[PDB]
């Protein structure tokens, strides 16, 4: 399942955090793009 949860921070950034692999990236995976 897409464990990619997008947290939109008031800092003005939406980083996609994968709650399965504990992956935190500032660029949305191919699942989103």
What residues have CB less than 8 Å from 12, skipping those under 6 apart? none
**23: its two tokens:** 């992956």
What residues have CB less than 8 Å from 25, skipping those under 6 apart? 15, 16
User: Closest Cα to residue 32, out of 19, 21, 22, 18?
Assistant: 18
Determine the Cα–Cα distance for residues 8 and 23; give it in Å rounded to an integer.
16
């Amino acid at each position: 399942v897409s464990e990619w949860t997008e947290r939109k921070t008031a800092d003005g950034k939406t980083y996609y955090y994968n709650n399965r692999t504990l992956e935190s990236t500032w660029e949305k995976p191919q699942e989103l793009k």
